[PDB]
């Protein structure tokens, strides 16, 4: 749905980062704006926040990571760039509400 708000700082950054570097694959990643601090990343819904409008982090199931870092993880074409991560340790079982 359309809300009608000027260029949001968080959204502005998220949009850029997601489109920079631009996904090489023939299929652009899944990124849709739902609500202030909410975006559809891939096949899951996370809460992307901005620290002092300087740092971009996301809400995961056990802490917060760098948006650009969470994307590179899934995005294969991104993994190319020098990256260093472990993974995700969480007990299977989705949520609804
Ligand atoms: Zn890609």
Swiss-Prot record:
Site (Cleavage): residue numbering on this chain: 86-87
Domain GAR: 8-78
Induction text: Down-regulated by mitogens.
Post-translational modification: Cleaved, during apoptosis, on a specific aspartic residue by caspases.
Tissue expression per record: Expressed in most tissues. Highest levels in liver, lung and kidney. In the embryo strongly expressed in regions that undergo extensive apoptosis, such as the intervertebral tissues, the cranofacial mesenchyme and the cartilage of the limbs. Expressed in the inner ear, in inner and outer pillar cells (at protein level).
Protein location: Cytoplasm, Cytoskeleton, Stress fiber; Membrane
Origin superkingdom: Eukaryota
Primary role: Required to maintain microtubule bundles in inner ear supporting cells, affording them with mechanical stiffness to transmit sound energy through the cochlea.
Family of this protein: Belongs to the GAS2 family.
Protein name: Growth arrest-specific protein 2
Organism classification: Eukaryota, Metazoa, Chordata, Craniata, Vertebrata
